[PDB]
């Protein structure tokens with residue numbers, strides 16, 4: 084039993100809700116919130132910009148030190164950093180950005196990072212400003228993640244469309 088509320092159960096382990104991931108994380112304080120990161124951890128917009136703003140830019144400060152030490156992530160890769168005031172840990176995961184021409188096949192690799200964590204609050208990877216089809220992202224999530232994932236969907240029409248079209 085955990086403290087996530089109002090989620091529709093899609094499968095044994097995947098749950099979905101129309102919610103603002105920042106407000107969700109602040110309420111639940113999950114062990115892990117997933118960020119829709121880029122390889123440079125430049126949290127400008129989308130989910131990443133929103134989460135970073137909620138940390139008063141502390142996420143960006145921590146991220147800049149991470150990059151200065153380690154260099155960029157790989158597309159499809161991840162790193163674990165602090166969750167600041169939002170969660171214990173933030174798993175920064177780089178899904179392919181279609182608007183940069185990146186290979187959508189790397190989306191499965193991106194979701195595989197979730198399997199290293201028993202429970203996560205997450206967005207749909209490569210959705211929103213990353214330019215992929217959210218229906219496809221949900222399908223890959225369901226077919227890749229085996230741990231318990233609570234998906235927070237910003238767009239209401241999308242949430243309803245994702246639910247009504249879910250196979």
Ligand SMILES: C[C@H]1CCN(c2ncnc3[nH]ccc23)[C@@H]1CO
Pocket residue numbers: 102103104105119129130133206207208209210211212235236237238
């Ligand atoms: C619509 C896309 C882009 C934004 N994003 C979000 N999802 C959940 N909570 C959020 N809070 C702020 C942004 C955001 C979706 C990720 O596929």
